[PDB]
Short mmCIF file of the N, C-alpha and C atoms (twelve columns), coordinates in Angstrom:
data_MODEL
# 
_entry.id   MODEL 
# 
loop_
_atom_site.group_PDB 
_atom_site.id 
_atom_site.type_symbol 
_atom_site.label_atom_id 
_atom_site.label_alt_id 
_atom_site.label_comp_id 
_atom_site.label_asym_id 
_atom_site.label_seq_id 
_atom_site.Cartn_x 
_atom_site.Cartn_y 
_atom_site.Cartn_z 
_atom_site.pdbx_PDB_model_num 
ATOM 1   N N  . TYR A 1   9.229  73.758  -65.472 1 
ATOM 2   C CA . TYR A 1   9.350  74.082  -64.543 1 
ATOM 3   C C  . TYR A 1   8.780  75.263  -64.303 1 
ATOM 4   N N  . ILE A 2   8.424  75.032  -62.784 1 
ATOM 5   C CA . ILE A 2   7.629  76.027  -62.105 1 
ATOM 6   C C  . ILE A 2   8.388  76.999  -61.162 1 
ATOM 7   N N  . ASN A 3   8.231  78.552  -61.346 1 
ATOM 8   C CA . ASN A 3   8.886  79.346  -60.497 1 
ATOM 9   C C  . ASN A 3   7.905  79.195  -59.162 1 
ATOM 10  N N  . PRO A 4   8.459  79.343  -58.175 1 
ATOM 11  C CA . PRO A 4   7.844  79.708  -57.090 1 
ATOM 12  C C  . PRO A 4   7.511  80.611  -56.461 1 
ATOM 13  N N  . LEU A 5   8.873  81.704  -56.998 1 
ATOM 14  C CA . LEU A 5   9.002  83.082  -56.606 1 
ATOM 15  C C  . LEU A 5   8.025  83.987  -57.469 1 
ATOM 16  N N  . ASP A 6   6.996  83.456  -58.120 1 
ATOM 17  C CA . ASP A 6   6.463  84.253  -59.118 1 
ATOM 18  C C  . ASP A 6   5.195  85.143  -58.414 1 
ATOM 19  N N  . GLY A 7   5.393  85.468  -57.611 1 
ATOM 20  C CA . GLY A 7   4.704  86.423  -56.806 1 
ATOM 21  C C  . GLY A 7   3.124  85.879  -56.747 1 
ATOM 22  N N  . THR A 8   2.676  84.580  -57.035 1 
ATOM 23  C CA . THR A 8   0.879  84.174  -57.715 1 
ATOM 24  C C  . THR A 8   0.251  84.456  -56.469 1 
ATOM 25  N N  . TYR A 9   0.591  84.963  -55.190 1 
ATOM 26  C CA . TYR A 9   -0.460 85.248  -54.066 1 
ATOM 27  C C  . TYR A 9   -0.204 87.035  -53.225 1 
ATOM 28  N N  . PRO A 10  -1.015 87.442  -54.080 1 
ATOM 29  C CA . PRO A 10  -1.170 88.683  -53.977 1 
ATOM 30  C C  . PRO A 10  -1.914 89.296  -52.566 1 
ATOM 31  N N  . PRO A 11  -1.033 89.727  -51.675 1 
ATOM 32  C CA . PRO A 11  -1.571 90.130  -50.086 1 
ATOM 33  C C  . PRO A 11  -2.901 91.024  -50.026 1 
ATOM 34  N N  . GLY A 12  -3.624 90.809  -49.128 1 
ATOM 35  C CA . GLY A 12  -4.890 91.574  -48.557 1 
ATOM 36  C C  . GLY A 12  -6.091 90.587  -49.669 1 
ATOM 37  N N  . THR A 13  -5.576 89.281  -49.459 1 
ATOM 38  C CA . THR A 13  -6.863 88.839  -50.635 1 
ATOM 39  C C  . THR A 13  -7.169 87.561  -49.587 1 
ATOM 40  N N  . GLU A 14  -8.110 86.697  -49.963 1 
ATOM 41  C CA . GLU A 14  -8.674 85.703  -49.492 1 
ATOM 42  C C  . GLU A 14  -7.541 84.359  -49.573 1 
ATOM 43  N N  . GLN A 15  -7.153 84.330  -50.951 1 
ATOM 44  C CA . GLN A 15  -5.902 83.500  -51.225 1 
ATOM 45  C C  . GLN A 15  -4.881 83.995  -50.030 1 
ATOM 46  N N  . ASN A 16  -4.379 84.852  -50.092 1 
ATOM 47  C CA . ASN A 16  -2.897 85.063  -49.317 1 
ATOM 48  C C  . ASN A 16  -3.834 86.511  -48.274 1 
ATOM 49  N N  . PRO A 17  -4.256 85.849  -47.304 1 
ATOM 50  C CA . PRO A 17  -4.650 86.702  -45.887 1 
ATOM 51  C C  . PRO A 17  -3.670 87.806  -45.059 1 
ATOM 52  N N  . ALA A 18  -2.518 87.869  -45.656 1 
ATOM 53  C CA . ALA A 18  -1.456 88.243  -45.497 1 
ATOM 54  C C  . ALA A 18  -1.649 89.837  -45.422 1 
ATOM 55  N N  . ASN A 19  -1.646 90.761  -44.352 1 
ATOM 56  C CA . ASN A 19  -1.489 92.270  -44.675 1 
ATOM 57  C C  . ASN A 19  -1.010 92.563  -46.062 1 
ATOM 58  N N  . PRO A 20  -1.733 93.648  -47.073 1 
ATOM 59  C CA . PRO A 20  -0.967 93.599  -47.966 1 
ATOM 60  C C  . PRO A 20  -0.432 95.278  -48.092 1 
ATOM 61  N N  . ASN A 21  -0.302 96.207  -46.897 1 
ATOM 62  C CA . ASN A 21  0.281  97.036  -46.398 1 
ATOM 63  C C  . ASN A 21  1.643  96.378  -45.905 1 
ATOM 64  N N  . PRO A 22  2.620  97.299  -46.821 1 
ATOM 65  C CA . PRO A 22  4.314  97.463  -46.115 1 
ATOM 66  C C  . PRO A 22  4.186  97.998  -44.820 1 
ATOM 67  N N  . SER A 23  5.284  97.560  -44.210 1 
ATOM 68  C CA . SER A 23  5.052  98.046  -43.094 1 
ATOM 69  C C  . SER A 23  6.322  98.594  -42.347 1 
ATOM 70  N N  . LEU A 24  6.414  99.621  -41.518 1 
ATOM 71  C CA . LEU A 24  7.613  100.776 -41.621 1 
ATOM 72  C C  . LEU A 24  7.992  100.196 -39.954 1 
ATOM 73  N N  . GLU A 25  9.051  99.985  -39.763 1 
ATOM 74  C CA . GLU A 25  9.812  99.943  -38.429 1 
ATOM 75  C C  . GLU A 25  11.061 101.130 -38.655 1 
ATOM 76  N N  . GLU A 26  11.077 102.156 -37.570 1 
ATOM 77  C CA . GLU A 26  12.073 103.068 -37.351 1 
ATOM 78  C C  . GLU A 26  13.134 102.521 -36.849 1 
ATOM 79  N N  . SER A 27  13.133 100.897 -36.546 1 
ATOM 80  C CA . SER A 27  14.290 100.344 -35.773 1 
ATOM 81  C C  . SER A 27  13.601 98.989  -35.593 1 
ATOM 82  N N  . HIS A 28  14.859 98.299  -35.903 1 
ATOM 83  C CA . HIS A 28  14.474 96.849  -35.904 1 
ATOM 84  C C  . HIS A 28  14.101 96.305  -34.016 1 
ATOM 85  N N  . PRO A 29  13.093 95.668  -34.387 1 
ATOM 86  C CA . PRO A 29  12.568 95.068  -33.065 1 
ATOM 87  C C  . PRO A 29  13.097 94.004  -33.079 1 
ATOM 88  N N  . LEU A 30  13.776 93.056  -31.737 1 
ATOM 89  C CA . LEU A 30  14.017 91.893  -31.342 1 
ATOM 90  C C  . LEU A 30  13.224 90.698  -31.615 1 
ATOM 91  N N  . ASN A 31  11.840 90.923  -32.550 1 
ATOM 92  C CA . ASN A 31  11.418 89.827  -33.136 1 
ATOM 93  C C  . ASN A 31  11.498 89.747  -34.600 1 
ATOM 94  N N  . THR A 32  12.503 90.344  -34.722 1 
ATOM 95  C CA . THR A 32  12.862 90.353  -36.430 1 
ATOM 96  C C  . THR A 32  14.159 89.728  -36.163 1 
ATOM 97  N N  . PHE A 33  13.924 89.126  -37.432 1 
ATOM 98  C CA . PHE A 33  15.399 88.007  -37.789 1 
ATOM 99  C C  . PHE A 33  15.921 88.675  -39.280 1 
ATOM 100 N N  . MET A 34  17.234 87.823  -38.917 1 
ATOM 101 C CA . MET A 34  17.464 88.075  -40.552 1 
ATOM 102 C C  . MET A 34  17.717 86.497  -41.340 1 
ATOM 103 N N  . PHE A 35  17.474 86.407  -42.816 1 
ATOM 104 C CA . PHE A 35  17.469 85.131  -43.477 1 
ATOM 105 C C  . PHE A 35  18.173 85.441  -44.724 1 
ATOM 106 N N  . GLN A 36  19.031 84.662  -45.473 1 
ATOM 107 C CA . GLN A 36  19.604 84.878  -46.683 1 
ATOM 108 C C  . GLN A 36  19.937 85.995  -46.757 1 
ATOM 109 N N  . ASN A 37  20.893 86.509  -45.965 1 
ATOM 110 C CA . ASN A 37  21.721 88.163  -45.911 1 
ATOM 111 C C  . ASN A 37  20.848 89.053  -45.736 1 
ATOM 112 N N  . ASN A 38  19.531 88.809  -45.634 1 
ATOM 113 C CA . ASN A 38  17.976 89.942  -45.441 1 
ATOM 114 C C  . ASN A 38  17.474 89.884  -43.988 1 
ATOM 115 N N  . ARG A 39  16.799 90.772  -43.969 1 
ATOM 116 C CA . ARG A 39  16.060 90.955  -43.165 1 
ATOM 117 C C  . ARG A 39  14.699 90.826  -43.073 1 
ATOM 118 N N  . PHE A 40  13.429 89.801  -42.068 1 
ATOM 119 C CA . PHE A 40  12.414 88.988  -42.549 1 
ATOM 120 C C  . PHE A 40  12.355 89.561  -41.468 1 
ATOM 121 N N  . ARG A 41  10.282 89.461  -41.779 1 
ATOM 122 C CA . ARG A 41  9.550  89.678  -40.183 1 
ATOM 123 C C  . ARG A 41  8.990  88.633  -40.357 1 
ATOM 124 N N  . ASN A 42  8.486  88.282  -39.156 1 
ATOM 125 C CA . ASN A 42  7.552  87.044  -38.804 1 
ATOM 126 C C  . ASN A 42  6.721  87.645  -37.807 1 
ATOM 127 N N  . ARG A 43  5.486  87.965  -38.225 1 
ATOM 128 C CA . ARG A 43  4.388  88.078  -37.818 1 
ATOM 129 C C  . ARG A 43  3.163  87.105  -37.639 1 
ATOM 130 N N  . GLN A 44  2.779  86.558  -37.236 1 
ATOM 131 C CA . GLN A 44  1.682  85.762  -36.766 1 
ATOM 132 C C  . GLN A 44  1.748  84.454  -37.609 1 
ATOM 133 N N  . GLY A 45  2.475  84.053  -38.681 1 
ATOM 134 C CA . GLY A 45  3.335  83.376  -39.524 1 
ATOM 135 C C  . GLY A 45  2.643  83.690  -40.517 1 
ATOM 136 N N  . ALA A 46  2.934  85.089  -40.458 1 
ATOM 137 C CA . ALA A 46  3.348  85.831  -41.965 1 
ATOM 138 C C  . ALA A 46  4.674  86.167  -42.227 1 
ATOM 139 N N  . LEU A 47  5.231  86.207  -43.270 1 
ATOM 140 C CA . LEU A 47  6.287  86.624  -43.552 1 
ATOM 141 C C  . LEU A 47  7.012  87.580  -44.496 1 
ATOM 142 N N  . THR A 48  7.745  88.641  -43.694 1 
ATOM 143 C CA . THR A 48  7.644  89.852  -45.028 1 
ATOM 144 C C  . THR A 48  9.336  90.145  -45.268 1 
ATOM 145 N N  . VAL A 49  9.510  90.522  -46.464 1 
ATOM 146 C CA . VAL A 49  10.744 90.809  -46.836 1 
ATOM 147 C C  . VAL A 49  11.174 92.491  -47.020 1 
ATOM 148 N N  . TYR A 50  12.065 92.389  -46.688 1 
ATOM 149 C CA . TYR A 50  12.596 94.065  -46.432 1 
ATOM 150 C C  . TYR A 50  12.301 94.734  -48.003 1 
ATOM 151 N N  . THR A 51  11.907 96.037  -48.489 1 
ATOM 152 C CA . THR A 51  11.959 96.504  -50.062 1 
ATOM 153 C C  . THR A 51  13.461 97.304  -49.752 1 
ATOM 154 N N  . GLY A 52  13.339 97.614  -48.464 1 
ATOM 155 C CA . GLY A 52  14.595 98.666  -48.299 1 
ATOM 156 C C  . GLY A 52  14.083 100.214 -47.150 1 
ATOM 157 N N  . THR A 53  14.879 101.093 -46.983 1 
ATOM 158 C CA . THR A 53  14.504 101.988 -46.250 1 
ATOM 159 C C  . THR A 53  13.929 103.311 -46.802 1 
ATOM 160 N N  . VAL A 54  12.853 103.630 -46.353 1 
ATOM 161 C CA . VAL A 54  11.778 105.047 -46.989 1 
ATOM 162 C C  . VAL A 54  11.651 105.700 -46.178 1 
ATOM 163 N N  . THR A 55  11.680 107.044 -46.764 1 
ATOM 164 C CA . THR A 55  11.948 108.655 -46.629 1 
ATOM 165 C C  . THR A 55  10.624 109.168 -46.635 1 
ATOM 166 N N  . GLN A 56  10.033 109.670 -45.874 1 
ATOM 167 C CA . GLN A 56  8.517  110.354 -45.896 1 
ATOM 168 C C  . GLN A 56  9.115  111.675 -44.907 1 
ATOM 169 N N  . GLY A 57  8.310  113.156 -45.377 1 
ATOM 170 C CA . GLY A 57  8.569  113.772 -44.790 1 
ATOM 171 C C  . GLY A 57  9.834  114.835 -44.749 1 
ATOM 172 N N  . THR A 58  10.231 115.777 -45.753 1 
ATOM 173 C CA . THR A 58  11.927 116.410 -45.924 1 
ATOM 174 C C  . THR A 58  12.362 117.264 -44.759 1 
ATOM 175 N N  . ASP A 59  13.381 116.982 -44.594 1 
ATOM 176 C CA . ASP A 59  14.068 118.630 -43.676 1 
ATOM 177 C C  . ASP A 59  13.420 118.805 -42.262 1 
ATOM 178 N N  . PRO A 60  13.491 117.693 -41.478 1 
ATOM 179 C CA . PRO A 60  13.988 116.165 -41.493 1 
ATOM 180 C C  . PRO A 60  13.127 115.018 -42.440 1 
ATOM 181 N N  . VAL A 61  13.843 114.333 -42.805 1 
ATOM 182 C CA . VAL A 61  13.353 113.466 -43.343 1 
ATOM 183 C C  . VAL A 61  13.414 112.422 -42.641 1 
ATOM 184 N N  . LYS A 62  11.947 112.020 -42.510 1 
ATOM 185 C CA . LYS A 62  11.999 110.324 -41.760 1 
ATOM 186 C C  . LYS A 62  12.251 109.229 -43.090 1 
ATOM 187 N N  . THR A 63  12.804 108.519 -42.002 1 
ATOM 188 C CA . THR A 63  13.297 107.409 -42.923 1 
ATOM 189 C C  . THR A 63  13.169 106.098 -42.026 1 
ATOM 190 N N  . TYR A 64  12.112 105.088 -42.577 1 
ATOM 191 C CA . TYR A 64  11.517 103.984 -41.804 1 
ATOM 192 C C  . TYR A 64  12.169 102.547 -42.519 1 
ATOM 193 N N  . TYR A 65  12.579 101.285 -42.189 1 
ATOM 194 C CA . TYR A 65  12.513 100.382 -42.698 1 
ATOM 195 C C  . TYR A 65  11.193 99.678  -43.139 1 
ATOM 196 N N  . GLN A 66  11.347 99.573  -44.364 1 
ATOM 197 C CA . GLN A 66  10.094 98.956  -45.336 1 
ATOM 198 C C  . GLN A 66  9.549  97.310  -45.274 1 
ATOM 199 N N  . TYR A 67  9.012  96.874  -44.932 1 
ATOM 200 C CA . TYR A 67  8.648  95.512  -45.068 1 
ATOM 201 C C  . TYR A 67  7.832  95.007  -46.209 1 
ATOM 202 N N  . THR A 68  7.811  94.391  -47.404 1 
ATOM 203 C CA . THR A 68  6.456  94.019  -48.027 1 
ATOM 204 C C  . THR A 68  6.123  92.715  -47.787 1 
ATOM 205 N N  . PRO A 69  5.170  92.068  -47.626 1 
ATOM 206 C CA . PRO A 69  4.735  90.686  -47.127 1 
ATOM 207 C C  . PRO A 69  5.019  90.066  -48.791 1 
ATOM 208 N N  . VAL A 70  5.646  88.815  -48.380 1 
ATOM 209 C CA . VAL A 70  6.228  87.732  -49.619 1 
ATOM 210 C C  . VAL A 70  4.885  87.616  -50.562 1 
ATOM 211 N N  . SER A 71  4.851  87.863  -51.740 1 
ATOM 212 C CA . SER A 71  3.960  86.978  -52.612 1 
ATOM 213 C C  . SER A 71  4.498  86.114  -53.269 1 
ATOM 214 N N  . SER A 72  5.591  85.692  -52.701 1 
ATOM 215 C CA . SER A 72  5.994  84.296  -53.671 1 
ATOM 216 C C  . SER A 72  5.422  82.938  -52.555 1 
ATOM 217 N N  . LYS A 73  5.073  81.922  -52.811 1 
ATOM 218 C CA . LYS A 73  4.857  81.255  -52.476 1 
ATOM 219 C C  . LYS A 73  5.989  79.816  -51.630 1 
ATOM 220 N N  . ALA A 74  6.809  80.462  -52.227 1 
ATOM 221 C CA . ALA A 74  7.915  78.866  -52.067 1 
ATOM 222 C C  . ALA A 74  8.554  79.847  -50.921 1 
ATOM 223 N N  . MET A 75  8.172  81.348  -50.450 1 
ATOM 224 C CA . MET A 75  8.805  81.556  -49.054 1 
ATOM 225 C C  . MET A 75  8.009  81.182  -47.490 1 
ATOM 226 N N  . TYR A 76  6.913  81.059  -48.101 1 
ATOM 227 C CA . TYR A 76  5.944  80.971  -47.535 1 
ATOM 228 C C  . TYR A 76  6.042  79.347  -47.181 1 
ATOM 229 N N  . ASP A 77  6.131  78.636  -48.131 1 
ATOM 230 C CA . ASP A 77  6.308  76.892  -48.048 1 
ATOM 231 C C  . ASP A 77  7.737  77.200  -47.451 1 
ATOM 232 N N  . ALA A 78  8.488  77.720  -46.976 1 
ATOM 233 C CA . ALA A 78  9.759  77.502  -46.780 1 
ATOM 234 C C  . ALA A 78  9.245  77.746  -44.988 1 
ATOM 235 N N  . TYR A 79  8.644  78.577  -44.725 1 
ATOM 236 C CA . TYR A 79  8.038  78.223  -43.328 1 
ATOM 237 C C  . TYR A 79  7.727  76.943  -42.849 1 
ATOM 238 N N  . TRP A 80  6.292  76.638  -44.146 1 
ATOM 239 C CA . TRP A 80  5.419  75.545  -43.785 1 
ATOM 240 C C  . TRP A 80  6.120  73.867  -43.798 1 
ATOM 241 N N  . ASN A 81  7.065  73.688  -44.426 1 
ATOM 242 C CA . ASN A 81  8.178  72.905  -44.517 1 
ATOM 243 C C  . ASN A 81  8.706  72.409  -43.240 1 
ATOM 244 N N  . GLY A 82  8.881  73.602  -42.203 1 
ATOM 245 C CA . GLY A 82  9.331  73.244  -40.812 1 
ATOM 246 C C  . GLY A 82  10.792 73.920  -41.379 1 
ATOM 247 N N  . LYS A 83  11.516 74.778  -41.939 1 
ATOM 248 C CA . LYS A 83  12.296 74.815  -41.881 1 
ATOM 249 C C  . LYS A 83  12.466 76.791  -41.377 1 
ATOM 250 N N  . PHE A 84  11.618 77.641  -41.687 1 
ATOM 251 C CA . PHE A 84  11.295 78.851  -40.758 1 
ATOM 252 C C  . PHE A 84  10.670 78.266  -39.290 1 
ATOM 253 N N  . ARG A 85  10.376 77.085  -38.941 1 
ATOM 254 C CA . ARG A 85  9.544  77.022  -37.950 1 
ATOM 255 C C  . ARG A 85  10.891 76.538  -37.089 1 
ATOM 256 N N  . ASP A 86  11.623 75.755  -37.387 1 
ATOM 257 C CA . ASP A 86  12.913 76.054  -37.033 1 
ATOM 258 C C  . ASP A 86  13.920 77.307  -36.460 1 
ATOM 259 N N  . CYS A 87  13.762 77.996  -37.261 1 
ATOM 260 C CA . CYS A 87  14.868 79.370  -36.934 1 
ATOM 261 C C  . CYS A 87  14.086 80.244  -36.307 1 
ATOM 262 N N  . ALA A 88  12.387 80.258  -36.933 1 
ATOM 263 C CA . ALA A 88  11.838 81.734  -36.467 1 
ATOM 264 C C  . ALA A 88  11.190 81.622  -35.200 1 
ATOM 265 N N  . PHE A 89  11.517 80.540  -34.261 1 
ATOM 266 C CA . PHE A 89  10.575 80.792  -32.900 1 
ATOM 267 C C  . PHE A 89  11.704 80.547  -31.768 1 
ATOM 268 N N  . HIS A 90  12.873 81.341  -32.359 1 
ATOM 269 C CA . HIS A 90  14.236 81.213  -31.256 1 
ATOM 270 C C  . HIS A 90  13.866 82.442  -30.588 1 
ATOM 271 N N  . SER A 91  13.819 82.087  -29.093 1 
ATOM 272 C CA . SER A 91  13.339 83.464  -28.255 1 
ATOM 273 C C  . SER A 91  14.287 84.556  -28.521 1 
ATOM 274 N N  . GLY A 92  15.762 84.825  -28.306 1 
ATOM 275 C CA . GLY A 92  16.637 85.926  -28.245 1 
ATOM 276 C C  . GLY A 92  16.340 86.917  -27.940 1 
ATOM 277 N N  . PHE A 93  15.646 87.748  -28.887 1 
ATOM 278 C CA . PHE A 93  15.345 89.082  -27.972 1 
ATOM 279 C C  . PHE A 93  15.970 89.767  -26.801 1 
ATOM 280 N N  . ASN A 94  17.712 90.170  -27.686 1 
ATOM 281 C CA . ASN A 94  18.302 90.559  -27.307 1 
ATOM 282 C C  . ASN A 94  18.085 91.794  -27.918 1 
ATOM 283 N N  . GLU A 95  18.902 92.842  -27.268 1 
ATOM 284 C CA . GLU A 95  19.461 94.286  -27.900 1 
ATOM 285 C C  . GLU A 95  20.073 94.605  -29.368 1 
ATOM 286 N N  . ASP A 96  19.384 93.274  -30.233 1 
ATOM 287 C CA . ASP A 96  19.982 93.756  -31.699 1 
ATOM 288 C C  . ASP A 96  19.098 92.754  -32.838 1 
ATOM 289 N N  . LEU A 97  18.654 92.811  -33.689 1 
ATOM 290 C CA . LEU A 97  17.977 91.627  -34.814 1 
ATOM 291 C C  . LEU A 97  18.308 90.531  -34.386 1 
ATOM 292 N N  . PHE A 98  17.696 89.443  -34.570 1 
ATOM 293 C CA . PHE A 98  17.680 88.126  -34.376 1 
ATOM 294 C C  . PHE A 98  18.835 87.640  -35.955 1 
ATOM 295 N N  . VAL A 99  20.112 86.504  -35.982 1 
ATOM 296 C CA . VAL A 99  19.973 86.268  -36.492 1 
ATOM 297 C C  . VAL A 99  19.400 84.659  -36.662 1 
ATOM 298 N N  . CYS A 100 19.542 84.162  -37.953 1 
ATOM 299 C CA . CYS A 100 18.980 82.916  -38.067 1 
ATOM 300 C C  . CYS A 100 19.686 82.001  -38.547 1 
ATOM 301 N N  . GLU A 101 19.658 80.648  -38.331 1 
ATOM 302 C CA . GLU A 101 21.003 79.640  -38.205 1 
ATOM 303 C C  . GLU A 101 20.436 79.287  -39.937 1 
ATOM 304 N N  . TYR A 102 19.566 79.349  -40.408 1 
ATOM 305 C CA . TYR A 102 19.487 78.666  -41.630 1 
ATOM 306 C C  . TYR A 102 19.633 79.775  -42.802 1 
ATOM 307 N N  . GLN A 103 20.364 79.569  -43.697 1 
ATOM 308 C CA . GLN A 103 21.112 80.310  -44.541 1 
ATOM 309 C C  . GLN A 103 20.588 79.707  -46.327 1 
ATOM 310 N N  . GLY A 104 20.022 78.995  -46.070 1 
ATOM 311 C CA . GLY A 104 19.396 78.464  -47.659 1 
ATOM 312 C C  . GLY A 104 20.035 77.001  -47.579 1 
ATOM 313 N N  . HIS A 105 19.662 76.473  -48.270 1 
ATOM 314 C CA . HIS A 105 20.284 75.021  -49.080 1 
ATOM 315 C C  . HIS A 105 21.564 75.103  -49.556 1 
ATOM 316 N N  . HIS A 106 22.554 75.698  -48.715 1 
ATOM 317 C CA . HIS A 106 24.030 75.374  -49.514 1 
ATOM 318 C C  . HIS A 106 24.989 74.171  -49.154 1 
ATOM 319 N N  . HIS A 107 24.722 73.058  -49.237 1 
ATOM 320 C CA . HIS A 107 25.255 71.916  -49.001 1 
ATOM 321 C C  . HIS A 107 25.738 71.441  -50.462 1 
ATOM 322 N N  . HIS A 108 25.645 71.802  -51.196 1 
ATOM 323 C CA . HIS A 108 26.011 71.423  -52.397 1 
ATOM 324 C C  . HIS A 108 27.138 72.156  -53.407 1 
ATOM 325 N N  . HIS A 109 26.899 74.180  -52.820 1 
ATOM 326 C CA . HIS A 109 27.778 74.911  -53.058 1 
ATOM 327 C C  . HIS A 109 28.476 75.235  -51.550 1 
ATOM 328 N N  . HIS A 110 29.120 75.665  -51.831 1 
ATOM 329 C CA . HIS A 110 29.850 76.459  -50.124 1 
ATOM 330 C C  . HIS A 110 29.165 77.770  -49.859 1 
# 
């Protein structure tokens, strides 16, 4: 068995050229899309997964949505096999986060 989710590609490297810096968005841009009931970032072919919200500065605390570049080849592989190619490139760009039509391989299970 090989676990493709093992995070074997650390960002900020030659092996993974994706920016290793987790990104913070105060509010979700229309170029962002949700996949697998999660929120995902597509940036120049780089796929980012949200780790959650982050607070910085206290009273008022600033809370931003944090997206960390996926270190797991399987998420990128999902892109390269044209399953994210089929969904991440829809115009949308309407006043809300874009919803992806793909939701994983669920035609064996409900």
